[PDB]
């Protein structure tokens, strides 16, 4: 923001925002998968107990 | 005077006050264009070479 004229830097910042956004969604999806598998294990443990 | 195309003159500028205001406004300056930074906000970044 301190080097590029703001009428043009929006392209770069939008690319960077989209990349980080995709990374964050990937993290969330992996968390969902792992949480599902842990819930399955927890149900198994509850049955054991 | 100016030298030849293959004999392009080169100089190094150091230890001064980067005041591009005095130059940019003066003279018609038919062609003038920057590459990696906006040609409008030179006056808020510090250089080393």
Swiss-Prot record, chain A:
It comes from the Viruses. Subunit of the fusion protein that is processed upon entry into the host cell. Mediates fusion of the virion and cellular membranes by functioning as a class I viral fusion protein. Contains a viral fusion peptide that is unmasked after S2 cleavage. This cleavage can occur at the cell membrane by host TMPRSS2 or during endocytosis by host CSTL. In either case, this triggers an extensive and irreversible conformational change that leads to fusion of the viral envelope with the cellular cytoplasmic membrane, releasing viral genomic RNA into the host cell cytoplasm. This is Spike protein S2'. The gene is S. The chain holds residues 981 to 1029 of 1273 of the full protein.
């Amino acid at each position: 923001f301190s080097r590029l004229d703001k009428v043009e830097a929006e392209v770069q910042i939008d690319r960077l925002i989209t990349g980080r956004l995709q990374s964050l969604q990937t993290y969330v999806t992996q968390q969902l998968i792992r949480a599902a598998e842990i819930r399955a294990s927890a149900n198994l443990a509850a049955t054991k107990m | 005077r100016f030298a030849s195309v293959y004999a392009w003159n080169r100089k190094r500028i150091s230890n001064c006050v980067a005041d591009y205001s005095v130059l940019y406004n003066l003279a018609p300056f038919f062609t003038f264009k920057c590459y990696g930074v906006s040609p409008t906000k030179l006056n808020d970044l510090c250089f080393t070479n």
